[PDB]
Subunit: 145 residues, 3 copies
């Protein structure tokens, strides 16, 4: 999937970004079974003061995570996973839970392209990894930490 | 809700950001009943000329509001809220209305988290507030301009 | 439509940005039949090192298109246009297809404003584009490449 993660500039060091990215990627693999490299975490940094809560200007502890997913998963799972992104980012970034916003949007797999291919359904990933070129299979396996 | 606002760098001074974010927040709450703090306005600045229209590179006067809403509201209300945003940002950013694009996105409340918590149905908003931690009732209350 | 293009700062010259934007804008009108000025391509630049695939940080060679459409077009049609976007962006950004991710999102036209006006259904661009206003078409007609 794709996680847009809006944050203030300089709020996270490279280690913290790599820490927040990691906890999100491990939330997702861990509750869905998705092959790691399938997850993208994409930081959007903007200057602090660009974020307003109830018309009040905020400092730089706001975190907004927008996960773009595939249709097909239960409402009980999306909650856990959202809840787990809340907890594990709160630790990884050392910011209070109450500073964290998480929305999930969903689309059908057939209008969702990753690594230049169309995606499988959620219960079809095994077929997905057993019908790609190895130039492809090699690339994605470089994208796992 | 979360309103991502895409503007060209400095088209809105820090006050002008406050006015717009105050314009979006006051259309929402006024038209839905959503408590004041519930609304985030998120400014995403980019250098001028990163925006294209029909292929024609543009200047620093485009605005695109992308609204992320809970499912469960009528189309009437949503188009009503879309117009008032166009109207009230025009006035608050002194941008001509033909520059303002507004989209609304909906997701089930059950996969949306604000202040580390899952949202209610729009028909549950007030009770949801009551049974929050008092850390949470208060941290929220501090974000109402 | 609004295409959010997520690219790293400096991966694209002003000529290359116009190349990608022309690639997206053309595919979309070619396949939907929608009038030129209706398509916006919004570049969103961030320093390299902000994108993570499988927890591994990336250089400036990742591109993410998040496309936002009216509801009403077929799955085969949506799939064809994402594929065309992959092919044509890759060429116009001299980038390799494995580095391109494409997500389409859809919403009710009745909650979609462009140029400060509401949108017709995916086939109503005639009647709509012709009873606009005095200048609404006019200001929208300059935006053709």
């Amino acid at each position: 999937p794709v996680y847009m993660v809006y944050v203030s500039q300089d709020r996270l060091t490279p280690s913290a970004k790599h820490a927040v990215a990691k906890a999100i990627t491990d939330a997702h693999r861990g509750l869905t079974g998705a092959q790691h490299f399938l997850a993208q975490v994409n930081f959007q940094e903007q200057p602090a003061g660009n974020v307003f809560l109830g018309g009040v200007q905020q400092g730089g502890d706001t975190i907004f995570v927008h996960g773009l997913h595939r249709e097909g998963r239960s409402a009980d799972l999306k909650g856990q996973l959202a809840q787990r992104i809340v907890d594990d980012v709160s630790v990884a970034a050392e910011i209070d839970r109450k500073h964290i916003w998480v929305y999930f949007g969903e689309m059908p797999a057939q209008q969702m392209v990753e690594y230049g291919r169309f995606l499988p359904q959620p219960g079809h990933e095994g077929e997905w990894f057993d019908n790609l070129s190895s130039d492809e299979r090699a690339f994605m396996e470089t994208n796992v930490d």
